[PDB]
Amino acid sequence: GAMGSMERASLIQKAKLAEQAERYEDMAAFMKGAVEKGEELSCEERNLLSVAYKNVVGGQRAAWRVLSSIEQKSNEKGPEVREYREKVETELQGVCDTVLGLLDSHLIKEAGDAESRVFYLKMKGDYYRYLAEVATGDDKKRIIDSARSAYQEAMDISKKEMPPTNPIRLGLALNFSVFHYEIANSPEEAISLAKTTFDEAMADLHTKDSTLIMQLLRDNLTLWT
Amino acid sequence: GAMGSMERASLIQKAKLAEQAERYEDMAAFMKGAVEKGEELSCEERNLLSVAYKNVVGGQRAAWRVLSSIEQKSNEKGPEVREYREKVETELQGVCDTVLGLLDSHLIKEAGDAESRVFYLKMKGDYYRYLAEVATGDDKKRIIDSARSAYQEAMDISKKEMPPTNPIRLGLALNFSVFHYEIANSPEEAISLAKTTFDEAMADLHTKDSTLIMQLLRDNLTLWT
Ligand SMILES: O=c1[nH]cnc2c1ncn2[C@@H]1O[C@H](COP(=O)(O)O)[C@@H](O)[C@H]1O
Ligand SMILES: O=c1[nH]cnc2c1ncn2[C@@H]1O[C@H](COP(=O)(O)O)[C@@H](O)[C@H]1O
Numbered sequence A, B: 001g002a003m004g005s006m007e008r009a010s011l012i013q014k015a016k017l018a019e020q021a022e023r024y025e026d027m028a029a030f031m032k033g034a035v036e037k038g039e040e041l042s043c044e045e046r047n048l049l050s051v052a053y054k055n056v057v058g059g060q061r062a063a064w065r066v067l068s069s070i071e072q073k074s075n076e077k078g079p080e081v082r083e084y085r086e087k088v089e090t091e092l093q094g095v096c097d098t099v100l101g102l103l104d105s106h107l108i109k110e111a112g113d114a115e116s117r118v119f120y121l122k123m124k125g126d127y128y129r130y131l132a133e134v135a136t137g138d139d140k141k142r143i144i145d146s147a148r149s150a151y152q153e154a155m156d157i158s159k160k161e162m163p164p165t166n167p168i169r170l171g172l173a174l175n176f177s178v179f180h181y182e183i184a185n186s187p188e189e190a191i192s193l194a195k196t197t198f199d200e201a202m203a204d205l206h207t208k209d210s211t212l213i214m215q216l217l218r219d220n221l222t223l224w225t
Helices: A008-021 A023-034 A042-069 A080-107 A117-132 A139-161 A167-182 A187-204 A211-224 B007-023 B024-035 B043-070 B080-107 B118-134 B137-160 B167-182 B187-204 B212-223
Strands: none
Touching: A008 A023, A008 B043, A008 B080, A023 A080, A042 A080, A042 B007, A080 A117, A080 A187, A080 A211, A080 B007, A117 A139, A117 A167, A117 A211, A139 A167, A139 B118, A167 B167, A187 A211, A187 B080, B007 B024, B007 B118, B024 B080, B043 B080, B043 B118, B080 B118, B118 B137, B118 B167, B137 B167, B167 B187, B167 B212, B187 B212
């Protein structure tokens, strides 16, 4: 595709240039580029992937929210705001469906360092979650099953082979739980895991940046309870 | 074109939605849309035009600068950074050439309230200036003539029919002078006008937001002298 002709290492250098210039569209395009090569990504590369995708989909989800909100106070008048809301909703689904293709097509295989098999399964759950935040109907149904399947296979792996301070295991559990509350409408399952996790981490805290996740991880229990 | 089928007032409402959502690409697209209708813009509309275009071209010029800088420290190694720099340079020229089409094609006619005939001529000078910041050769030559022609016809009009507190006349002169220093390499002409203008404004200051322009207008003389 659009980067087919470019050397993998150049794609990677240009991702980094993009990041410096604050051009996440670019950065994501370059990374989709490298990924599409077929070489397994290093830890440092994967951080470029997620970071870029996250900022892109991030601003979309912002605008979506601004707009749904205006479409709430527009229920007490014109289609203009529903129309535009749908526009942004459609771009977002776009990016999600793209990132979800990378994971299904290249990144996830059932053969890898495993500490990152997680990173991907997690990423799969988050992007499927982002689709859930905007879907309706049976669409919303299936997407929910999917964020569950992934986030769960990522839990198994993270428990079995990851110490409970691993900012991966932390972040993952955090996410999976936000999903439990915000999406699947199951605050029992949500509170349990939010507690348990922050438990078994406050435990080995003796071994200092996972603490930021832990700040949030509890920060969430405030409102949940 | 892409908004041809949409009612002018809807375009305008959606610009405003865009602004709330912080989607300047959208906002600019919608406005190019309304402008393309053929109806003269009100003051409030024009502010949506400029604001949207400004933020778009604004982030481009940022990235350009980040990148040229990395391409400076890259002169003491790979084409990756020149290549990407050129990419961004080309998007920018794009947007400039678009905005410059709106002015030449719709917005500027030699028949209007005139206090805004200025607003456009000024806008023409700034976008031509933005092209100058990145051009070379005879290209750079012609573009400079063009930012001059415009900014000047905008000076005549602004002197003749505008009191020297008019945030338009202020801003204009400010810009025209930055051009004199930063682009046309003529600090004599630059210092003169920067002085003169801030003079005849400090004069009638007795008649309180143009002061922000005046803050800058002097702020510039610091470095210029
Ligand atoms: O850097 C991060 N990594 C993982 N989760 C985060 C991060 N920053 C914030 N969060 C959490 O994610 C929530 C928003 O959901 P998300 O951004 O869709 O994953 C926030 O309310 C936090 O609980
Ligand atoms: O809101 C504004 N209107 C007009 N000129 C501005 C504004 N903000 C900053 N400037 C000036 O414009 C310079 C940057 O050039 P410009 O952004 O290409 O017009 C700044 O250094 C200021 O002198």
